[PDB]
Symmetry: D3
Subunit: 254 residues, 6 copies
């Protein structure tokens, strides 16, 4: 067998990829999302009740479908990154990255020694298909994609420095965490926040990195796509489930 090609990583340079947030934390729900035709699915280990084993079930579900899986760990924890790479997550979104030093550590966390600090256990890993991918340890690093979140004042204070880190493929802006950090909690739509987001996207693309964002607002998501943003998540499964059920009930009952 040949290593699974990371099409998400390749497409960061060739097209704009439309994403769905997956927080229903279940292999059955993830499979429903995988049937829709999103370019990417974010399996959220930070803000949904997921662990390594529930994330594996969702990778196994999504694997039969063209949608590319991206996993967000709860934090930039090097041992947890090791675990998520070994179950076969090829794209990671690291929350709350705030320095070049932390971004460089996240690069090393995704690469085998001697250049990186990714722990070696290919005989045990779904990532290598338990060594049925016979050249895994030489081909693995090429198909790993590292995305970091800038979503704090300290992150913005270190943006130029993070954008200079080789091996950071993309910077994702987190509008909920960023608007809260800026004193606009629950109000990312404010001009003060939006002006910072737009300038940040422009800086990311000017440094030759992919820019990413989530907005469940159709008009903001389309504006971000017009700016050239490479990976845009346009909704959240928990939100779509709750809203569709509320909208339906409102046709019959107040």
């Amino acid at each position: 067998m040949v290593n699974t090609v990371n099409y998400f990583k390749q497409k960061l340079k060739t097209e704009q990829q439309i994403g769905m947030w997956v927080g229903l934390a279940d292999g059955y729900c993830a499979e429903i999302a995988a049937n829709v035709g999103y370019d990417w699915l974010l399996i959220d280990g930070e803000h949904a009740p997921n662990d390594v084993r529930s994330i594996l079930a969702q990778l196994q579900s999504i694997a039969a479908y063209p949608s590319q899986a991206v996993v967000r760990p709860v934090s930039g924890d090097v041992p947890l990154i090791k675990q998520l790479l070994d179950i076969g997550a090829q794209t990671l979104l690291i929350p709350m990255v705030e320095s070049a030093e932390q971004a460089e550590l996240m690069v090393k966390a995704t690469r085998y020694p001697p250049e990186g600090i990714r722990g070696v256990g290919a005989a045990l890993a779904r990532a290598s298909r338990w060594n049925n991918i016979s050249d895994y340890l030489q081909t693995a690093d090429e198909q790993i994609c590292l995305l970091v979140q800038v979503e704090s004042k300290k992150g913005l204070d270190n943006l130029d420095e993070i954008l200079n880190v080789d091996g950071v493929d993309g910077i994702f802006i987190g509008p909920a965490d960023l608007s809260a950090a800026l004193g606009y909690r629950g109000n990312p739509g404010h001009e003060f926040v939006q002006n910072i987001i737009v300038q940040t996207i422009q800086k990311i693309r000017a440094a030759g990195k992919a820019a990413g964002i989530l907005s469940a607002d159709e008009k903001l998501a389309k504006q971000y796509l017009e700016l050239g943003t490479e990976f845009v998540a346009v909704g959240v499964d928990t939100s779509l489930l709750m809203k569709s059920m509320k909208q339906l009930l409102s046709k019959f009952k107040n």
Copy 2:
């Protein structure tokens, strides 16, 4: 503690109850549905991948919310009905009931001896809260609601007989199974099917029983409500999740 009042059963005589089908087969998804404010939630053990233990998790989720739980077993199996009553399901929807004899057996399956054949294990049952409901074995039968599905030609051939069975609280029409039985598989909207559904609802209500149905078609659901149908399910969680995600993607990609 006093036995949990079955408000669904009481409301069969006083109002029209709006329902949501729950086929996502998970405690977390059931809790999302419970937050919307449906009169009833149908936990589907027939057409969703549920078992006694996954149904218990969903009863526990939904129990904190005013929505009334109804459980559909995979078939009119007396031992499975015993299990679903003991985990605390107070309303059951039995699929594919086709005779007065089968409906009578379903009544006995829901009632303690000596009148019925419900197995007795109150010390072990969530239904009795492990005997913290101190009079459970005396008060249980009063709060149990039995619904049967008529959804085959043999069911329609025994309708008057089923409507004469004391202890059947409601007859639910299954349009998917019934349209297939009638040779209109996937097309319940045909006049031949709809004329049979309407006369069936009229006969059910004329015999003083509650009539029920599911339609994800808003216009058909409202027409059934205009006929006086007592329990109308208006949608399905799996369908609402798939459709909302597809509708969203279509704003950005073909």
Copy 3:
């Protein structure tokens, strides 16, 4: 490896075995019960939310301890009996046995062809330790113990006939189901019920079968032991958990 000796089965002829009902339906709770030193533990598949897989977890827990596991299936279902034997349950308690014909079918359900109808899959079975017990298909039947419940009027109406069935090792009286069948639901302590229970125990032992019963009443359990009853369950884990927590809270408030 040699087949696991069924000590419960041997002790039916040599001592009186004290039992605990296990309805907490979890491997961790079953292990706590296994540490106490009961002669037997009844893993309840009838009145607790258990399935084959949760029953397997509890057999694996209990296997490291001297307590002997007995499994109660939800009914005398031949395919379910096959499944419970293959995960390695050596003693089964079949509920609601009501005829010699049903008791004979339960005997065949526990024995390999050509004498019985137990399905053969030793390569897959924990029962054979996946054929690490090399003579399993020759030695299995010897260590299987079949107990049947008499707990209905029809059961009592066929008692002499059931007691004549070779391969029935023991008859267990179910006081909750029997008192309900007799029109004393929730009141097994009535003299009318107790006189029937005592005569039934006497008839079972006079036919050379083991008699069994459950009573959470210390005085009745001790009377049943005085009669020579071979397997007496003296409590239920769910009841002991609820009662101990209530008794503790009562020291500090209402």
Copy 4:
């Protein structure tokens, strides 16, 4: 989306398919087996500790790989067949089929009304991808494959009659159950059993049906392939795991 083509069903007429028995009862173990390149994988619900939900997890695992999934239910139970078809199992192996009447009922159990008795719930089914396969209810029946086991004297007594049932695609011989039924329990290699197996394979192929069998004996499996047997399972995952670990330990320790 178009319905998933059943390549296993097509290949019954074009080639000999090599199979692996999957009894490790887990989505992670099933994925390991799916990586090897077997033509088919038998997910065993009869002799491994599987239920509908654990079988779904294994279908989701195997779905990303070319290996074709076949599911064996615990028995020819029509409601359980409904459940396994709705989670998306396209090929079923029914154990212990003993008459044309039972085989015809198994055909109806796999087909929608009005010709069959398969329950209709396409909005909820992984089988229809929750109606993302838009013509599922008209295209489903064509991709369903029904296999029945002949593995008892009564089965052999009704072989000509079962081979005349339209909609039975294949007859699988179960050597463990059959050798036990013939009084050769644990000894299927006896000439008396082997002569019956060979004649049975010849009769199955002479009636224009696919013949199938399992043998972990390489020489018998190759003899069955030389006879033209269309679907041959050549091993069992639990057996291969136990034997490989024993063989390795024997190199170091007695």
Copy 5:
């Protein structure tokens, strides 16, 4: 919907709350404990085999009952605190707090930016009911209660400093960890330990914070209540299960 009122937090200033430790690590066991009527239930993520997902199941169980849930994480880990708040834990008990600097970090970990560092993901959180609590990001912080454990010499060495931290609602004394730290492991009943516990409770209440403790000794628990201790846990579910089963068996054998 309005945010769930934290009654435990309110009652720290108005009454003495009686608590039960929940370490059976299961939604079904947590529901049994929720039926008893304790003021609070401690779901133990430190000393019971719990994770975020098992803690969510127990919050869902307990949510239908008046008992208030308190969650103990394994350590004062900021990302784990984020996860437990988002699944809807409103009261946290942080083990082994040893400085005002650590206590201040725990305060920030429970509060949204810009004042705190709690990660923002309200669309995904059971805590916001997936934004069905429409003002959650404005009202959340008010209903969060932070308790810290002092249970080491360094903790006692920083007690006055921790008691000066705004946002610490309560200090819980851990007698097992503290008696071990003091060189009286397994013997918290020693006068040297008890005199330190009593002075600590007095200092906590003198600084206007709630004091808490666990003792399964009725006499010590009642003495702590006489001192005015605001939150007293009086037992542990695992201990009550083991002890009740042992006490019962002792009536019938050694």
Copy 6:
């Protein structure tokens, strides 16, 4: 009950122990491995998808068999070590230990205060059998075995210092991580690597500590045993499953 004797720890001084890596991450697969007769089984929490709860299930499986369980946590995390000790793991293998200071911290993490920093919760712990081991807090430390991995250049740079740490019972060499650290990723068989491994084993034994290693290469494993290496793992369950299934298929298909 008396504390469970750690025979693995005792045998470090008396024999050479043969081990199997267990990475199938399931109680059922662990039980299969437990039946073979390995001296020790390594439950891998670092490179297999395990968590505290899945590791508990595997300890419960393995506990009925003479094989000794060793648990590898994902990292030298003090709170995770606390959790794994409380579920009853008596031998721990800590990955990537790189200094005497870290090794000393790992010793304290495994010992109760006042000498160590192991959190005290014996009423809740399977390790104490919920205090059914009445002297657990006095006898626990004696039966705990700490193994550390040296598998990086920094580890080798601090080897003499680590070998001087009292309470380190054994040093395990990780050839996959070490060969990668040395610039021979996927090629531990190189003379440069093997000469370092051999001198490392010699230094470990010269300092009176047990030496350990894993090699799935029979010739290297036997050479390590000839050097006197005290604990040698000779294979990996995932590898043996994949290889045995591939070897079997190759007899029938290319």
